[PDB]
A = this chain, B = another copy of it.
Amino acid sequence: SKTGGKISFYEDRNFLGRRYDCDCDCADFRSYLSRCNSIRVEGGTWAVYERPNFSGHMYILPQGEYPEYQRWMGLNDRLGSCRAVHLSSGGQAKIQVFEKGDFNGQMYETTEDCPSIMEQFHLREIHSCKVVEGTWIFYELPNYRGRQYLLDKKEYRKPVDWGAASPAIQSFRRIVE
């Protein structure tokens, strides 16, 4: 799963026999193993399928050590393909900003970035803000220059709550994983 995601199939109970290892999708492994009867998932979370090419019944596995096929709700040692469930769509973040403080004045909501809040919003300062999802950097200047502040919480009622000595912030941007 690209952050250490890997999964290892074994042909005997309790991690024995031949072992086959997979870092990505793999649409068939019936060549390497005849049967899979235990799995260790060291990284990530896997769709694992009975036949090859992602066919048959599907069982899914996160990090952990599975010594018997029944403790993934399996029904045979028949497995043939696996797909990594790659994580949530990054498109989940959102933020609310206010003109006056303590959530007063005109308030504007956005799931995207903001180069010049003067231009897209016609506000000079920002005195309070709720983060509803995600994490955000506040910039004192347009174009993501200047003093930086990190909004890793939920709500903020005046600029010092994000560690600013002034309401001068003029652009903001989301971080992603």
Q: Which residues of A contact B (CB under 8 A)?
A: 1-5, 10-11, 15-26, 28-29, 31-32, 41, 43-45, 47, 57-60, 62-67, 71, 73, 84-93, 133-135, 137, 144-145, 147-150, 152-153, 163, 174-177
What are 10 sample pairs from A and B whose C-beta atoms fall under 8 A apart?
Answer: A3-B26, A4-B23, A11-B64, A15-B65, A16-B66, A32-B62, A62-B176, A62-B177, A88-B134, A92-B92
Contacts of A85 in B (CB 8 A): 135, 150, 152, 175, 177
Contacts of A148 in B (CB 8 A): 57-60, 73
Contacts of A4 in B (CB 8 A): 3-4, 23
Measured between C-beta atoms, what is the minimum distance from A75 to chain B in Å?
9
Q: How many copies does the complex hold?
A: 8
Contacts of A177 in B (CB 8 A): 1, 32, 44-45, 62-63, 85, 87, 89
Measured between C-beta atoms, what is the minimum distance from A123 to chain B in Å?
23
Beyond known contacts A17-B66, A19-B63, A92-B92: 17 more, CB 8 A cutoff:
A3-B3, A4-B4, A23-B23, A23-B24, A25-B25, A31-B176, A32-B177, A47-B150, A57-B148, A58-B147, A60-B150, A87-B90, A87-B175, A88-B89, A88-B91, A89-B177, A91-B92
